[PDB]
């Protein structure tokens, strides 16, 4: 198998969480700014399976 593809798919899953965390952690860390706002993100998928 070309397992390595599933890895960055797995890593990307962790990438999604960590950035998504960063979105909220920013919100917690930078809540009080005289002005402040929410942010959000979308996810996507890349290649076919090993057919």
């Amino acid at each position: 198998m070309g397992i390595f593809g599933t890895l960055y798919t797995g890593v990307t899953g962790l990438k999604a969480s960590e950035v998504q965390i960063a979105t909220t952690g920013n919100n917690i860390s930078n809540a009080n700014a005289t002005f402040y706002t929410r942010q959000r993100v979308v996810q996507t998928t890349n290649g076919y399976i090993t057919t």
Binding site: L7, G10, G13, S17, G25, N27, A31, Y36, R38
Partner: protein, 50 residues
């Protein structure tokens, strides 16, 4: 009033931040376990031909 309606949905709310904070942590964990589970196959895979 125009204040209130931006306030109605704009910036930071404890349970919102807390909930997602937990969720991704769990998500970061679910991925870690399975990825290591993938790692265990690398071993099996190698063993197949080793």
């Amino acid at each position: 009033s125009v204040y209130s309606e931006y306030q109605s949905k704009s910036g930071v709310n404890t349970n919102e931040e807390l909930a997602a904070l937990i969720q991704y942590q769990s998500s970061y964990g679910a991925a870690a376990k399975i990825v290591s589970t993938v790692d265990q196959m690398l071993d099996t895979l190698l063993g197949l031909k080793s």
